[PDB]
Design an enzyme around this catalytic site. Structure first.
Site, PDB file in Angstrom:
ATOM      1  N   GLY A   7     -37.916  54.844  51.287  1.00 21.92           N
ATOM      2  CA  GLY A   7     -39.099  55.230  52.021  1.00 21.92           C
ATOM      3  C   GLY A   7     -39.908  54.023  52.438  1.00 21.92           C
ATOM      4  O   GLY A   7     -40.639  53.490  51.621  1.00 21.92           O
ATOM      5  N   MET A   8     -39.782  53.577  53.689  1.00 24.27           N
ATOM      6  CA  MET A   8     -40.556  52.424  54.163  1.00 24.27           C
ATOM      7  C   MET A   8     -41.993  52.867  54.449  1.00 24.27           C
ATOM      8  O   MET A   8     -42.227  53.781  55.240  1.00 24.27           O
ATOM      9  CB  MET A   8     -39.940  51.838  55.434  1.00 24.27           C
ATOM     10  CG  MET A   8     -38.516  51.368  55.280  1.00 24.27           C
ATOM     11  SD  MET A   8     -38.436  49.924  54.282  1.00 24.27           S
ATOM     12  CE  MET A   8     -38.442  50.630  52.635  1.00 24.27           C
ATOM     13  N   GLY A  10     -44.474  50.276  54.818  1.00 25.48           N
ATOM     14  CA  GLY A  10     -45.144  49.161  55.448  1.00 25.48           C
ATOM     15  C   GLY A  10     -45.955  48.474  54.374  1.00 25.48           C
ATOM     16  O   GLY A  10     -46.857  47.684  54.664  1.00 25.48           O
ATOM     17  N   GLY A  11     -45.628  48.802  53.124  1.00 27.19           N
ATOM     18  CA  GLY A  11     -46.308  48.223  51.980  1.00 27.19           C
ATOM     19  C   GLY A  11     -45.501  47.064  51.428  1.00 27.19           C
ATOM     20  O   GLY A  11     -44.283  47.023  51.579  1.00 27.19           O
ATOM     21  N   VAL A  12     -46.171  46.121  50.786  1.00 16.70           N
ATOM     22  CA  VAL A  12     -45.481  44.966  50.251  1.00 16.70           C
ATOM     23  C   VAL A  12     -44.348  45.426  49.364  1.00 16.70           C
ATOM     24  O   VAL A  12     -43.227  44.959  49.489  1.00 16.70           O
ATOM     25  CB  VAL A  12     -46.433  44.083  49.418  1.00 16.70           C
ATOM     26  CG1 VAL A  12     -45.778  42.747  49.131  1.00 16.70           C
ATOM     27  CG2 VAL A  12     -47.754  43.880  50.150  1.00 16.70           C
ATOM     28  N   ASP A  13     -44.651  46.354  48.470  1.00 12.86           N
ATOM     29  CA  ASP A  13     -43.647  46.858  47.547  1.00 12.86           C
ATOM     30  C   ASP A  13     -42.384  47.249  48.310  1.00 12.86           C
ATOM     31  O   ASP A  13     -41.441  46.465  48.391  1.00 12.86           O
ATOM     32  CB  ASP A  13     -44.180  48.059  46.744  1.00 12.86           C
ATOM     33  CG  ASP A  13     -45.413  47.718  45.908  1.00 12.86           C
ATOM     34  OD1 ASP A  13     -46.529  47.682  46.473  1.00 12.86           O
ATOM     35  OD2 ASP A  13     -45.262  47.486  44.683  1.00 12.86           O
ATOM     36  N   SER A  14     -42.376  48.459  48.864  1.00 13.91           N
ATOM     37  CA  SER A  14     -41.249  48.977  49.645  1.00 13.91           C
ATOM     38  C   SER A  14     -40.325  47.877  50.159  1.00 13.91           C
ATOM     39  O   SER A  14     -39.182  47.765  49.726  1.00 13.91           O
ATOM     40  CB  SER A  14     -41.771  49.761  50.853  1.00 13.91           C
ATOM     41  OG  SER A  14     -42.794  50.668  50.482  1.00 13.91           O
ATOM     42  N   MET A  33     -42.339  58.265  56.724  1.00 25.06           N
ATOM     43  CA  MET A  33     -42.978  59.565  56.882  1.00 25.06           C
ATOM     44  C   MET A  33     -44.362  59.472  57.505  1.00 25.06           C
ATOM     45  O   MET A  33     -45.132  58.569  57.202  1.00 25.06           O
ATOM     46  CB  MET A  33     -43.100  60.267  55.521  1.00 25.06           C
ATOM     47  CG  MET A  33     -41.801  60.426  54.774  1.00 25.06           C
ATOM     48  SD  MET A  33     -42.051  61.325  53.282  1.00 25.06           S
ATOM     49  CE  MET A  33     -41.256  60.293  52.107  1.00 25.06           C
ATOM     50  N   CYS A  98     -48.036  64.768  45.632  1.00 20.11           N
ATOM     51  CA  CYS A  98     -47.560  64.034  46.788  1.00 20.11           C
ATOM     52  C   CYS A  98     -46.150  63.584  46.466  1.00 20.11           C
ATOM     53  O   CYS A  98     -45.352  63.319  47.364  1.00 20.11           O
ATOM     54  CB  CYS A  98     -48.460  62.821  47.066  1.00 20.11           C
ATOM     55  SG  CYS A  98     -48.319  62.115  48.736  1.00 20.11           S
ATOM     56  N   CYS A 195     -52.457  59.601  48.585  1.00 17.93           N
ATOM     57  CA  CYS A 195     -51.231  59.116  49.184  1.00 17.93           C
ATOM     58  C   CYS A 195     -51.105  59.744  50.560  1.00 17.93           C
ATOM     59  O   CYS A 195     -51.298  60.944  50.720  1.00 17.93           O
ATOM     60  CB  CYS A 195     -50.035  59.504  48.316  1.00 17.93           C
ATOM     61  SG  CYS A 195     -48.471  58.724  48.760  1.00 17.93           S
TER      62      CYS A 195
END
Length: 364
Positions: A7-8, A10-14, A33, A98, A195
């Site tokens: 699940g991308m 756009g967060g640093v993690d992902s 999503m 979520c 979320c």
RNA sequence: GUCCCCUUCGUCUAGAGGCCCAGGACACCGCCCUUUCACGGCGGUAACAGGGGUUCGAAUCCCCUAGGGGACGC
């Protein structure tokens, strides 16, 4: 070389998280999503561009980015029940569903029904460890920063079909790997708020999905003290927004909530981050879910949180029904709020929690 | 109309001529923390009822006008 849809966000993690599978071998495709129909514009862009950040990483990585719109079900199975229990003067954890109704169902479903993959992967800083044939949930390293709490709803099944890459790393590393690779996301507000929904200021957000009727604020000594303007806007152990400014016979301590009076539309405050009417010796949890997905009968002996990032507080559990549980805090617990979830851990493992509906008042 | 006391940041107050361009607390505002709501950390804004005197000097001392007291407030 199985298929993996991460699940991308756009967060640093992902980002780091995908690149880690990518390296790890796996065929890696990511999906983004879009699950909330922002009312404002200042809000749109914020989450619109949050996508360009998402994409631009999949590209810099060389991965296809899939768009999806579960917004339909977000409201349907989450934000709706969200506003519900709130109206009822309780504190619900949107995020906690979520993951139960989307990120690990709605998504997971659309993984194979369409995208056709055999492994979903979120960037949830948590870990998965299969043993004796049953896929188990468990918080990652970097103890302090971890999200095991938000996934007590998951089951071995769901988990098993999921992949949690970063939960192995340590936050600083992650936020760096990205910086090195060059992923545009490195150096980005870790993220807050519901979320999918924006990190906006509550009162204005919640005060746009429910009414607004003032009221009275009472001390623990049945006496007037403040103007309750609203009610759902607060929660046990809340400190801000209570206008109070200390008086003659007051320990100068700040005032905290202690109980909402549903009908009489009251706001029972008190004073002191330790006052007896803000502690408990246990509570009772309903809507239970064990990652194990085994039936729970008898007596347990573990630890339990009662709000995100709280702190493993020892406890004993005993079945009080086929859905409810009676746990007994090894020591008084502060502001056990009803509506929030209570996740129990058996050490490294997270056994899954359940919804709180009854605290256990301190003896006088 | 009994010829005596009152008034300080939003609020509860410190303050008994130079140490107060007024201090703390709670609130309020902000940042940090945090994928819920909250807690927590840190820091910021803010007042001497008003006008005159007296002193080298006044929040504090005197004087003047707008809030509370005298088992008789016949």
């Amino acid at each position: 070389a199985k298929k993996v849809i991460v699940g991308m966000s756009g967060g640093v993690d992902s980002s780091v998280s995908a690149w880690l599978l990518q390296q790890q071998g796996y065929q890696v495709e990511g999906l983004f999503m879009k699950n909330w129909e922002e009312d404002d514009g200042e809000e749109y862009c914020t989450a619109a561009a949050d996508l360009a950040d998402a994409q631009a990483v999949c590209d810099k990585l060389g991965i296809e980015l899939h768009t999806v719109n579960f917004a339909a079900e977000y409201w349907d199975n989450v934000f709706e029940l969200f506003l519900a229990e709130y109206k009822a003067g309780r504190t619900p954890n949107p995020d906690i569903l979520c993951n139960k109704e989307i990120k690990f169902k709605a998504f997971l479903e659309f993984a194979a029904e369409d995208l056709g993959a055999d492994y979903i992967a979120t960037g949830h800083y948590v870990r998965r460890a299969d043993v004796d044939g049953k896929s188990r949930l468990l918080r990652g390293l970097d103890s302090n920063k971890d999200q095991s709490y938000f996934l007590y709803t998951l089951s071995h099944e769901q988990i098993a079909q999921s992949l949690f890459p970063v939960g192995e790393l340590e936050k600083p590393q992650v936020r760096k790997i990205a910086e090195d690779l060059g992923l545009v996301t490195a150096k980005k507000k870790d993220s807050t708020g519901i979320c999918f929904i924006g990190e906006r200021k509550f009162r204005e957000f919640l005060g746009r999905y429910l009414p607004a009727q003032p009221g009275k604020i009472i001390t623990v000594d049945g006496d007037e003290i403040g103007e309750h303007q609203g009610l759902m806007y607060h929660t046990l152990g809340q400190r801000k927004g209570l206008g109070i400014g200390g008086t003659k016979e007051g320990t100068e301590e700040p005032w905290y909530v202690v109980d909402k009076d549903v009908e009489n539309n009251i706001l029972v405050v008190a004073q002191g981050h330790e006052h007896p009417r803000l502690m408990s010796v246990g509570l009772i949890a309903q809507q239970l879910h064990w990652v194990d997905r085994e039936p729970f009968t008898g007596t347990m002996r573990c630890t339990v949180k009662t709000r995100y990032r709280q702190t493993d507080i020892p406890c004993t559990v005993k079945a009080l029904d086929d859905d409810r549980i009676e746990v007994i805090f090894d020591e008084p617990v502060a502001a056990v709020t009803p509506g929030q979830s209570a996740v129990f851990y058996n050490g490294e493992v997270c056994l899954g929690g359940g919804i709180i509906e009854q605290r256990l008042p301190l003896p006088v």
